[PDB]
């Protein structure tokens, strides 16, 4: 329970200069925070849960540290470890009045100290002092012989969920810290709680699992606010700092520690990120804790060990944090996109990048243009697209094994019908592997997409093999005019081919061929364009 | 072997003999994405099987749609370089794409082109600032109801599509061919859906309609369409039908938005016709008053009549102000909630926003009027220069960025209307925008022009100065270090306004002086207090007292510090000067004079300052 | 200056005439949504409930909520025989909202709006007064049932927090206006209407609300308000104790202050109106007696000197 | 530098000059054949005064070699293109541009 002063009792926040010892009164945000909490333990084992009786001795216990409050000569009044917390140094009692002023009750006992209404002066029975405070907002408390009248501390119950959370903070810190100290032991010693730890990780992840969409809205928002609350409740106590430094110490390796342990390690690290994600699914402030830390996340984006979980993390960081969207710059996005290159089309990645691109409401234009310059112009990465015109080919009914020749007069070429130039490759091709399926055939499809293919004409005439547009010169240096007469030649065994525009040579061309195929003439075409075959009505001989 | 699409329609072979004349008739085209990494082209229509890439690619479309960024356009041209215009149009025309992709390309056609223009348009569509042109006179609240008339006029700044040129602001499409296309799409949708044939285009009715009704909805909020096309829309809705169709809880939302454009436009025509009557009646009445400031009160005397035979003309037109979409909207919303238990709250909120707009259109007018503001026909062009600038700053409200706002606020500074019609300016709420940007910036050297703007905005009028005065607690909480001299400009003039201020504001300011125990910020705060108290002549006591009570405690041999400042920076001496000045502006209240005599105790400062010449 | 005179005419024709009592539609609108796995009125109520239940730090000005809340707010021995039909009509309307969960909607809205005193809260209280008006048992019981079935805790934090602000009267503020209580009216009418019909369980609920994690005593708050309010009244008396004759602004807003203190002593008396002894003991050990004492000072001297002249007897009367 | 190549012949007479309103269809692809532009996709012809420096230098110098009606492959040098800057979002730095220009008519 909390101890409201009229504002409430608490200790120093996590990772304090104090080493979390000295007590303080404080108002503000801490009142909702867990470090404000204080378990009240009567000295008796039995019937401790009996109604608190005025003036009975009781150890007070801060939960999140687990430590017991005590008078101490060494540092004045301080909360302190139980091992040092002998009862003489730490007894206390609640009372109606400043005046000064017995038998145990093995039963629930008489009702007395109501929450929020039964004010209760604190007193240390072993010394007879009082919980005075000295006269920023850190109104520090120390024991003292007197104490002015507003010193009264009316009590207020903690929520179930919250105290569960806090004790959970104690167990959690108390496991991960010794995990870390154990990680340090072999960092300098090439050659550990573990499954104890992993159970805690899975359980902390279960404890933070966001509510289902399947839930009705009211229960959903309730469980959701409870979720945000618990997230903050691990936030103030440095659970994020803890998980991040555990991830820091676990990121050193891709494996020291014995092999018995190392096999679980790949789980642990990844599990941690999952755990980490859970603390930042919703609450913005934790993302604000990552605002300075983003570069860290980015490096760990590139780790490719735990892999995807670091990405889900970063995505949780971005989806709910304008600050983080502001701070991010060249390197980080270039590393993100580089991850897109390094895994291959996770859609999560693009979700991360659009989440970078637009904060909830406002746009962040530098980030936008940066996404553009580091994605779009290269074109090599994400699925580029275009409205291609169909190619379609036809051949004379009979193929070829001696030497052979055929003309193909052009009839009616329309250059830029539609956006594309109309396709008219013409030339030899083998049966065994040339299967020009009309819908998409490598590159943008068409004749000449294959080694099997041996082609000529179209767009300055010249030739295609493999796919390459090799621009052999011709005396006319022309395409295929509707008047034009394509001319084609071939020999058996000898791999020679040569072409003529309007009955005159277009130099030598490509040579060596498989005889594995049985060659046939090909006339590819597109749009409304038509052409006369001339297998021999020759107009040139 | 890998199965793939047979190609839904394929080429016309037309061969024969003699020379064997192979032939063709018409072009056909693949919508072909490729994968460069595998260097394999593929038609996107095939993509509805290897659906992992469907997800990836639909998210690429989310990324383009996102990177175009709402209010961004420099980026969009590149998106023209990629997504390709014609490719979009083919993406719309065909009705075999899988639906996330389909809706993704409609979303791109919205974003890359139409969306930014729609942002420029909507915020001004909320405004009702009609010209007193002769064209805006023969409107009449009734035709000699039915929305979508071409006489809507107002000002409402023109769209600016820069053509997507790549040799060397917003990307261009053919607006009319596209309006016709989208119109044909709604018609094809009403038909094919009305026969209840069930392809269903997108693999869902949602994909069959929602993207298209979206495209038409932005397209129509944009003001593209020209009377008869709007008639096509309304005939495809009411008819008087897409509205009567059975629907998924999604398309209904788009119907809610489209119909919301109809009702909003109807409000446009209503307020506009009422203003046209302001001309048609006031031109008459002014001749009546001249046949025989406070003139406004006399106009209120003209407005007392309902409780000078011109009054009967009012007694008809008010009944015109009483007003069949008014049937169907209420009936349909009520049918929708009645038969379905609709979920997705957004659809609901749209529904009953529509519904409250329907049962209380007189009040919709009553809220619409203050934003409406009649304008002289000659000057409107300047407002045409004005509004677009506001659009610009309103583009900046949702975000270099700074140069635009500077040059735009300057363009607003230069305008003649910004002199001549301050009421329009506060009616636009534009200062609230400029403050909004002002605060988004605060959390530099863009702040500055904004402050000159809010200060001069204080200068232009006192009634407007109170309008700036409302924000002072906000403006001061925002001033951690200048907005504070903007507040000073807010407080500078009116005595009633200096009395109007809460003690809490001066408390905030003096708390800022409590934060200045270590400066120039302090002399700034003291200056705000200076305008706060001294007012025009002897300082108002009501504020001066409170300011001194606050300065008893916060702005902390102090006179030695003057000579210590003289031995040298001097800004501390400027702070002590501002302080002794602020205490020099304070004189029941006899005791406070003793409080100030307590700090002559001066004397030596005038001699030391004279010796430091 | 035709544009000037036209804008001015827009301002004047908006200042009057457009202000016809069109609002008669509102009532029918409700039943139009009453027409019939529920009903449209129910859809809209459940939608606003959906809005209230979401965390938002602070609720945004939901214009549509203000509007429909105002709509529902307006939705509600021959003279005795007419009066039974009229009171029963009112109960029919109030149940017309009550069956559709609007009570829990109001309750969640006041909850969600927390300690800010937005105009929207004012609308929630308008609707709450519209729902309770006559002191329905049905509503009070569904609301108490709501508040126990869901231990909100922050609901009374809301009322307490807004009541810590609320409105008073203030002396210097009048001294400088020389050259807004309606919400406190709605609010303590609210708290009175929660307790009308002598609901012992709900008064005791106000005294502590046992199920919640934080007890909060609305009565000691209310008495605190009545206290600061007399303090303001008394100082405002010393503003006029020397002046004899009173300014009409001092006879206007002072009357408003009387409307407030009246609505509030009505709230306390409604809190104690049953013999719920516990609330009595709660309010007795509370600092009300300072407050009745101070009104007794104001009610001595104002009660004498207001009598001195005929113009002020009206203000003496209230 | 820039290296214009003829694709299909024009009139062979009417070369572009100062102050003329050149009217062309074209397409734009990269070294890799990655198209980044195409005038026919718009089905709107492109119109530029030549020598007015509204266009990239390689387009500004190389189209002059073309005749009316002529189609030509302008393998423009990057330095005469967008240069080391590269057109943002579209053209990578130091990317040689490959055009399939078709000059419709000088105006």
Swiss-Prot record, chain A:
Localization annotation: Sarcoplasmic reticulum membrane
Effect of residue 365 to C: Decreases threshold for channel activation by K(+), caffeine and 4-chloro-m-cresol. Decreases inhibition by Mg(2+)
Tissue-wise expression: Detected in skeletal muscle (at protein level). Fast- or slow-twitch skeletal muscle.
MIR domain span: 1-43, 49-108, 110-159
Ranges where the B30.2/SPRY domain occurs: 332-536
Region span, Interaction with FKBP1A: 412-423
Source species, domain of life: Eukaryota
PTM info: The N-terminus is blocked.
Self-association and partners: Homotetramer. Can also form heterotetramers with RYR2. Identified in a complex composed of RYR1, PDE4D, PKA, FKBP1A and protein phosphatase 1 (PP1). Repeated very high-level exercise decreases interaction with PDE4D and protein phosphatase 1 (PP1). Interacts with CALM; CALM with bound calcium inhibits the RYR1 channel activity. Interacts with S100A1. Interacts with FKBP1A; this stabilizes the closed conformation of the channel. Interacts with CACNA1S; interaction with CACNA1S is important for activation of the RYR1 channel. Interacts with CACNB1.
Domain notes: The calcium release channel activity resides in the C-terminal region while the remaining part of the protein constitutes the 'foot' structure spanning the junctional gap between the sarcoplasmic reticulum (SR) and the T-tubule. Pore opening is mediated via the cytoplasmic calcium-binding domains that mediate a small rotation of the channel-forming transmembrane regions that then leads to channel opening.
Protein family: Belongs to the ryanodine receptor (TC 1.A.3.1) family. RYR1 subfamily.
Misc note: Binding of [3H]ryanodine indicates that the heterozygous channel is activated by Ca(2+) concentrations 4-fold lower than normal. Single-cell analysis of cotransfected cells shows a significantly increased resting cytoplasmic Ca(2+) level and a significantly reduced luminal Ca(2+) level.
Protein's UniProt name: Ryanodine receptor 1
Gene that encodes it: RYR1
From Swiss-Prot, chain B:
The record's account of how the chain is modified after translation: The N-terminus is blocked. Channel activity is modulated by phosphorylation.
UniProt note on tissues of expression: Detected in skeletal muscle (at protein level). Fast- or slow-twitch skeletal muscle.
Cellular localisation: Sarcoplasmic reticulum membrane
Quaternary assembly: Homotetramer. Can also form heterotetramers with RYR2. Identified in a complex composed of RYR1, PDE4D, PKA, FKBP1A and protein phosphatase 1 (PP1). Repeated very high-level exercise decreases interaction with PDE4D and protein phosphatase 1 (PP1). Interacts with CALM; CALM with bound calcium inhibits the RYR1 channel activity. Interacts with S100A1. Interacts with FKBP1A; this stabilizes the closed conformation of the channel. Interacts with CACNA1S; interaction with CACNA1S is important for activation of the RYR1 channel. Interacts with CACNB1.
Positions in coiled-coil regions: none
Family: Belongs to the ryanodine receptor (TC 1.A.3.1) family. RYR1 subfamily.
More about this protein: Binding of [3H]ryanodine indicates that the heterozygous channel is activated by Ca(2+) concentrations 4-fold lower than normal. Single-cell analysis of cotransfected cells shows a significantly increased resting cytoplasmic Ca(2+) level and a significantly reduced luminal Ca(2+) level.
Residues included from the entire protein: 1607 to 2476 of 5037
Residues found modified as Phosphoserine: 539
Domain notes: The calcium release channel activity resides in the C-terminal region while the remaining part of the protein constitutes the 'foot' structure spanning the junctional gap between the sarcoplasmic reticulum (SR) and the T-tubule. Pore opening is mediated via the cytoplasmic calcium-binding domains that mediate a small rotation of the channel-forming transmembrane regions that then leads to channel opening.
UniProt protein name: Ryanodine receptor 1
Origin: domain of life: Eukaryota
Naturally occurring in which organism (per UniProt): Oryctolagus cuniculus (Rabbit)
Swiss-Prot record, chain D:
E.C. designation(s): 5.2.1.8
PROSITE patterns: FKBP_PPIASE
Reaction(s) catalysed by this chain's protein: [protein]-peptidylproline (omega=180) = [protein]-peptidylproline (omega=0)
GO cellular component: cytoplasmic side of membrane; cytosol; intracellular membrane-bounded organelle; ryanodine receptor complex; sarcoplasmic reticulum; terminal cisterna
Modified residues annotated as N6-succinyllysine in this record: 52
N6-acetyllysine: modified positions: 52
Disulfide bonds: none
Activity regulation: Inhibited by both FK506 and rapamycin.
InterPro entries to which the protein is assigned, alphabetical: FKBP-type_PPIase (IPR050689), PPIase_dom_sf (IPR046357), PPIase_FKBP_dom (IPR001179)
Primary location class: cytoplasm
Pfam family, one: FKBP_C
MF terms (GO), sorted A to Z: peptidyl-prolyl cis-trans isomerase activity
Function text: Keeps in an inactive conformation TGFBR1, the TGF-beta type I serine/threonine kinase receptor, preventing TGF-beta receptor activation in absence of ligand. Recruits SMAD7 to ACVR1B which prevents the association of SMAD2 and SMAD3 with the activin receptor complex, thereby blocking the activin signal. May modulate the RYR1 calcium channel activity. PPIases accelerate the folding of proteins. It catalyzes the cis-trans isomerization of proline imidic peptide bonds in oligopeptides.
Subunit structure: Interacts with TGFBR1; prevents TGFBR1 phosphorylation by TGFBR2 and stabilizes it in the inactive conformation. Interacts with ACVR1B and SMAD7. Identified in a complex composed of RYR1, PDE4D, PKA, FKBP1A and protein phosphatase 1 (PP1). Interacts directly with RYR2 and RYR3. Interacts directly with RYR1. Interacts with GLMN; rapamycin and FK506 abolish the interaction with GLMN in a dose dependent manner.
Family (UniProt): Belongs to the FKBP-type PPIase family. FKBP1 subfamily.
Protein name (Swiss-Prot/TrEMBL): Peptidyl-prolyl cis-trans isomerase FKBP1A
